[PDB]
Every structure is written in structure tokens, then in C-alpha cells.
Symmetry: D2
Subunit: 240 residues, 4 copies
Amino acid sequence: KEFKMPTGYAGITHEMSEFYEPVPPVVTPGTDLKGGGFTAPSDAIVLFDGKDLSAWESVKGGAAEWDVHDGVFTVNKKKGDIQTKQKFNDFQMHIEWQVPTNITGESQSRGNSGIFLQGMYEVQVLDCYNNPTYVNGQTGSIYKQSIPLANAMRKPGEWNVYDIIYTAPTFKEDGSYRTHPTVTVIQNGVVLQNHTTILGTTEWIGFPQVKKHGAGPIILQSHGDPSEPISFRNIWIREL
Amino acid sequence: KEFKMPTGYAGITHEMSEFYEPVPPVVTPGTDLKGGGFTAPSDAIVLFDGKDLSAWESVKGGAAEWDVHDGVFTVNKKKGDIQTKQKFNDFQMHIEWQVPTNITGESQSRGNSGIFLQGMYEVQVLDCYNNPTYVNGQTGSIYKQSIPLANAMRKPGEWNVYDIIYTAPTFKEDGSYRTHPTVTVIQNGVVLQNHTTILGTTEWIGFPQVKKHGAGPIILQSHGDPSEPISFRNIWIREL
Amino acid sequence: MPTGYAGITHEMSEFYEPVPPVVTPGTDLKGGGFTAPSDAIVLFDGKDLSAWESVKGGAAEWDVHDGVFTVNKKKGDIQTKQKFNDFQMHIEWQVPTNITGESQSRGNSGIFLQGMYEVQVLDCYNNPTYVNGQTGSIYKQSIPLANAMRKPGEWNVYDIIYTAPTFKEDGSYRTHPTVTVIQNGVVLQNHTTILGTTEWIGFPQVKKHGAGPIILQSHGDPSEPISFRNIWIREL
Amino acid sequence: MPTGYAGITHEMSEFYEPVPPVVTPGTDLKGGGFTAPSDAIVLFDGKDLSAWESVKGGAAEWDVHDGVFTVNKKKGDIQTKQKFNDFQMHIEWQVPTNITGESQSRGNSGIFLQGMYEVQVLDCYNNPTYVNGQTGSIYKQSIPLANAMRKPGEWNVYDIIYTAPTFKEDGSYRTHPTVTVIQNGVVLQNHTTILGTTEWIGFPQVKKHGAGPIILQSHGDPSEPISFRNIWIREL
Ligand SMILES: [Mg+2]
Ligand SMILES: [Mg+2]
Ligand SMILES: [Mg+2]
Ligand SMILES: [Mg+2]
């Protein structure tokens, strides 16, 4: 039978390592979307949940003129990229995307879009379901920098779920990186980028570039190839 | 009108940054479980999907004697902790848990369990839905080391979803840490640990301890307080 | 010329900006280490403590003599007038030949990085103490990789490379500070993560701060005071 | 006796193990830096190259004289017999006073960490070149934080702290290597991540390896050969 409270090295007690502040904020999490992932938690900014693109704007200025219908929105390649009105630093993000069942094209010209983190660093979106391409630029790559850990594609018609955790960089006075950005990317529950260091801007041509910036929007890419446009749904973001 | 392929610094072409190996493995992802998260992808080890605990054993040796029923398994506190037969290093993990609707108790004595990563580092499981406790030991904490970024609890009866990404430590010859373990923890889609460094063993009493180890099992905690036992479902793990 | 994958040439990976600044390095001090490079702030090179102040306000009243300065325990801690974030630092210190005392009460001083995080200074030449608080420790957090002490009378050389933390809006750490410490050419802290304030009692504390001075510790035990020389700092 | 949160006492955060090993540090070399501490492997201190071998197999046939050794470009690279993982390293090098050449063809050598990752050696005293390949660069990957050259005839001092990578089963990096480089007391690489092999042509390559030697480069341009002294390494 026990007769006294146990103590540790030099008499330390369990209470001495029990703290009551800072209190983590209470968040009511979202629910599961059929064929998708989590909907927005109570402290998240809802960027899209089926109604409109009022949280977005054209990169050319003015309203975001992608097509909203049936609880999704669809890229209009004649209108170009759209971006969040709001700018971000560290964040967690959710976004779901669908390659249409009538998709055509090969390699980089088949359902190409992308999520530009702070407007600088592309997380590639592409139909890589039975579509080979260069591996450092396939789905879930940090475009042309970091090869994804897997190909976790769902087929056209189904929804590919991204969960993204992003840490923004800091810059020195002279414009060079003080700390690089880092990103974790999970696609359909599969980790594709595991705390990957971002080397600089994602570039189609040449080495990544070091360009000082502060907070930036999320930019969704209108890739001007002729492939049928992809659709998006259930986009939310919460600042970390 | 275009008349030549664009080039970058010193004539670099887009092809010179396009690589076709190493090819990421093709994984068929799982589906969404109603009220939960993702089921196991094709390359994952299924630790539980409703049938039995054949992937587990008692920490005392022999069969894992927690109670399997209705597609879940329920802690039997008289039997003690259970652990995976298999040992792991770096991994991604999924696990869902339910506080029963008739739960009773306060603070650390209310639906207390936990996931010991490699058998050494507890990710706390606890009913913190309207139940205050010490914040460095509440739900999703790295127990008594790292306070979770939020309280993202679902109420009793509903399923709390964990997605965990873990990097194992390396040890020096003298037994000290060469690299510390790191962990990301997401609960119901909300990030609770963002690439958190683990300082050593999780301890109820005293400072974290530095104890050299290699690969270790996942241990699920039977916390011997009188509260009604929690239930688990949809457990899978994939090695990174 | 030879070419690589898809015809890439050696010129395509040769960049001419940004140009690293030209620094004239210092020289070697006999019995010590490097003197200040041309872009460094000279905190002490034998003349005076004009770069320092008392933590109580006013002049730094430690005793300058013979090209060194010596702790005056009756006056308390001194600190740099200037505040710093990321930096590289050099500092040399001498335990006097007539030193007395044991454990933490034998030539105890310290370098508080941004005023918050102590790199321990102590005479650990044939003087055991608690290992997480011995010379070159991040005090009571990180045990040094070695004991690289020179004996009393000789000069112990610190080279320190420090990365400042960032803080979240709620006051918690966004990124922790990191520090490398080299004593007499031997690495004692290898890119060590600092957990919070260094504390004699209790767990490290998380206290939001910006730029901070370098504070040199006057530890009020009765041991004979240590002396300092060749202190410089350059911002990173 | 003062106490902290929930009555915690100062003794409860005072640990007496693990005890850091006692190391007798080296001394200061005139015009250079620290000589080898007692636990360091002495790779060169003036006598011979018995710790080295030709990369082609057999004896290292660079020329030992006057307490230094000098590159013989007809013989090619030399490397340590011993292989290393994590380490701290010291190495001093001299551009001869009669040096000639421009850009990469002027006193070019280098230290290949584990045989894979070049820390550039070059005479960049009034000699411009591409900045990502100048002195103290991680060759063509990471531009050094400064140009801290001493002139020809004088000794440039490197202190290097290196963490080896780990590799996944499929041959990709699990953890990248990191390196700190200090030249003549000035930090040139501050815990820099190495991206892969250093390459004259193309992107850095990911090639699985274990422990590797230190390789010193014989760069086959016609410039007068550089000399080395005071090389030591200690495992971390
Ligand atoms: Mg794209
Ligand atoms: Mg528990
Ligand atoms: Mg002290
Ligand atoms: Mg070279």
C-alpha cells in the first residue's frame, strides 16, 4: 500500500512541472466534407465555401472572375490568376481541387494550376493520375525545387485534398534570407512535403531567386495551356 | 508574336531544371471516414480498421486484451498499456479517439490516454471539452514539455482525429542527443504542434530525460484513473 | 567546353552579385585569439569602458588597468550601451592566480546574450560543479560539450555566434534563439537551441523581448574578481 | 531560502552528469589561430603527411618543408586516411607572395568535407570572381557572408564546424549537412545548409554516402601552389 507522494531528483514534485498559462484558445473544429477533408474551424478565415469569391481579387485588379457554380469555382483561363485580398505570414491552409472527368493533355499541360504561398512559392497542382512529367515539377512539388515524397493522386472527378502548414521567411537588411520559409504539404492524407525548406522563388527558368518580401496573398494559378479547367472547393486559412 | 524560346541568366533554359528521377512512388490514398478523417493509404500499415488487435501486444507480453466491438476498440484499464508489435523510426500516423458520452472526472482524470511515440514521447489524449487542466499536459501536448497551439476538442460521443508526423532523433556515442525528435500534431484539422522539438522523455515528475534508444513501438496508454474508458478507431501508420 | 544535364554550362551557375563586403580581419593576440575585424564594434581593447554602462544607470565602474578590466562586485553588472539581435562576439577572460572558492563560487561571471541568456563563465580548472551550470553552459539548460579550461593566470578565449529569437503576437517563441560557443578553439555549444531565460531557480521562462545589450555578470560570491580583455562584436 | 513556482528549489535543477570531458586546449600560433587540443587528431603540424594519402592510392606526395606543406599540382588531390562524420576542423593556408592569375585560377584549392562538399579556397585579396564560388563559399551554393582575406604571404585561418547528413533508404537526404565556417575570426558561413555535392556544372547532386575523408584540392590551373599548416580535426 502507498503511504506518500513520490518525488524525483532532489525532491522535485509533479506540481512543479504543471503550468496553467498560457491557456490555448478554444477552437470549434469543422466537420468532414464527403469525398474531401475538414471544413473550416471557428477561428479560420473562410476563403471559399460555395457562395462567392468575395475574399478574392484578380491579380490585374478588380473582382476575381473565375466561375462559381454548384458549390465549387472553376478556373477561367481567359481571366488570369486570382489572389486573396488579405495577406498572410505564417499559416495553416486547406484547399480541395478536382480534375474534370473530360480532362485532356500531357505532362505540365494537364490540369495545371498552383498555390503560390505569399505569392512567391508555388505548391504545384497538376493531374498526375497516369500522367508522367518531370518529378521536381509534379503534383505537390515545391515547383522545381523539392520533389514530393509520393504521388497520392485521386482520379479525375474526385477531389484532391491539400492541407498545408507554412512558416514565412525572415530577411536580413541586405535582402538575403535570414530564415528560409518552410512548408508541410499533405495530399489526401499522405505527406508529400515534410517540413521542406523553400530555397527562394519557384521559377520555370533558372535558379530560385532571393527577393525580399513581407506578408503576401495566396495566388491561384491560371496556367494558359489548353487543358480543361480544374475546379476548387472548401478553401480556408488560419493564421499561426 | 513569339520567335524564340525564352531563356534566363547566361542562357539557361527551362529544360535544364527539369528532372525525371527519382520518381515518387504511386500511392492510392484512402477515403474519408464519416465523422473522422482519412483511412489508410495503400502503402500504410493498418494498425486497426475494425477487425482485431493482431498488430498489437500487451506491454506485459502476450495478446493485446483491449475490447474490440462495433468497429472500435476500447481501453480495458485492468489490462494496462498495449503497443504495436512493430517498431518505427520516422513515420506519419493517423488515429481517431472517442470520449464516451457518459464520461466523468476532472483535469488529468477524465478520458486520459496517450500515444507514446517510439514508446518514449507522449502525445497526450484527454477530454478537454469543458475540462480545464494544466496547459502543458492538456490534449495534444507533448506531455509537460510543449503546450498545444489550441484546444480543438470535439464533444463526448464524437471522434477526435489525430494526424501525426514524426521525425526520430539520432544519438551520439556518449548517449546524448545528436538530433532531437520533432513532431507535428493536427487535431480535427487544427495544428496543435507545429514541428515541435521534443526535449527528451515525457515525465510526470522532473525534467525530460535523455535516454538513448533506437526504433520503438507506438504505445497506447491505459491511465489508471476511474474515468470511463475511451475508444479508438482507424489507426494507420506509414514509414517515412 | 564540357556540358551537363540538358546542356547546362558552368557559366549558368556563376553569379556576380550580391558581393560580400570586404573586411580587414584582426590579428592574433598573444595567449588569446583574434582581435577585432574592421567592421566590428570594439567593446574593449584596453583603453576604457566608454561602450558600457552600469545596469543601474550611469558609467560602467569596473576597473580598467594594464590593458584589461576587472570586475568590481560592489558595483554590480555592466552592459553594452548598444543593443543587438544576431551577432558574432569575441571575449577573453582571466581567472586570477590567487583565486579561491568552490563550485559556483569560484570566478563566476557570465555573458547574458541580449540580456536574457547566460553563457556561463566560471573557473572549472580542477573545480567540479553541477555540469549544466559549468563553464560554457547555457546556464542550467545545456551542458557544454567539453571542459576546455586554461589555468588561472592564462586567458580563456570565447568566440560566440548568436541568432536571436522571434516572438509571436501572444508573446510565445516563434523561433528560439540559437548559439554556438567556442572556448580556446574547442566547440562547447554546437548550434544549441536556447529554451528561454537562464534561471537559477525553476524552468526557463518565455519573456518577449527585442534587441538587447550584452550584460557581464557581477556574481556576488566572495571569490577574487575575474578580468576581461579583447571584446568585440559584429552584427550579422 | 528563496523558492520558485510551486516551491521548486535551486538544487532541483542542478545535475552532476553527464560530465563533459576535460580537454587541454592548444596554444595560439603566431600569425594564425589555435593549435590542436589534446583530444584532436593532428593531421599536420609540420613533420609529415603520414595522416594523408593520394586519392589515386599510395602516399600523399605534396611537398613538406619549413613546417608547412605545399600543393604539387602534378600529383593531384590528397585526402585523410581516416574518415569522418560530425567534426570540428582547423586549417591554415597561405597564398604565396609571387602568386599570379585571376578569378578561379588564382590560388584555387579547397576542403571537401567528407569528400563531397567543397569549402572554397582561393586568393580573393584584390581578385574578383563569381561570388558563389569565392573564398569560403560552399562552392556554387552559398555565398560567403564576407571577404575576410589576408594578403599573400600571410596565413588565412579556417575554423570549420560540420554536421554530416543522414540518408533515407531510397538514397535521398533525410537531413542535409550543415556547416559553419570562420575565416581569420570572421564568420563566413553561419550554420549553412548544404544542398548536395558541390558542382562546377549543373545543380548540386544527391549521392548517398557514409563517413568520408577530408580531401584537399589540387586545382590544375597554372597559378603558383598554395601552402598549408596547422591542420587538426576533432570528432563531434
Ligand atoms: Mg502550376
Ligand atoms: Mg496521458
Ligand atoms: Mg555566471
Ligand atoms: Mg577550389
